[PDB]
Amino acid sequence: DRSEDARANAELLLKGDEQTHKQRMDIANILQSQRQNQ
Amino acid sequence: DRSEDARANAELLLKGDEQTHKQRMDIANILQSQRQNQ
């Protein structure tokens, strides 16, 4: 049970960080798009 | 149990390092984008 919950929370936290850094990645795409736009 | 926990912690640590180096990889994308921007 406790080893399982360790694994689960680890992977879930991992994909949460994937969503955060991917989201800020998209933000970076919009910023770079704006900076060479002009 | 103990061999299983070895495997699990190994894979989870591995994918965590994948998230770290991928994250700094994205940082590197932003940096290279900035250095040839000008």
UniProtKB/Swiss-Prot annotation, chains A, B:
It comes from the Viruses. It is found in: Virion. Belongs to the p22likevirus portal protein family. Forms the portal vertex of the capsid. This portal plays critical roles in head assembly, genome packaging, neck/tail attachment, and genome ejection. Procapsid assembly may initiate with a nucleation complex composed of portal and scaffolding proteins. The portal protein multimerizes as a single ring-shaped homododecamer arranged around a central channel. Switches upon genome packaging from an asymmetrical conformation in the procapsid (PC-portal) to a symmetrical ring in the mature capsid (MV-portal). This change of conformation may serve as a signal for headful packaging. Homododecamer. Interacts with the terminase large subunit; this interaction allows the packaging of viral DNA. Interacts (via C-terminus) with the head-to-tail adapter protein gp4; this interaction participates in the head completion. Interacts with the scaffolding protein; this interaction initiates procapsid assembly, thereby ensuring incorporation of only one portal ring per capsid. Interacts with the capsid protein. This is Portal protein. The chain holds residues 678 to 715 of 725 of the full protein.
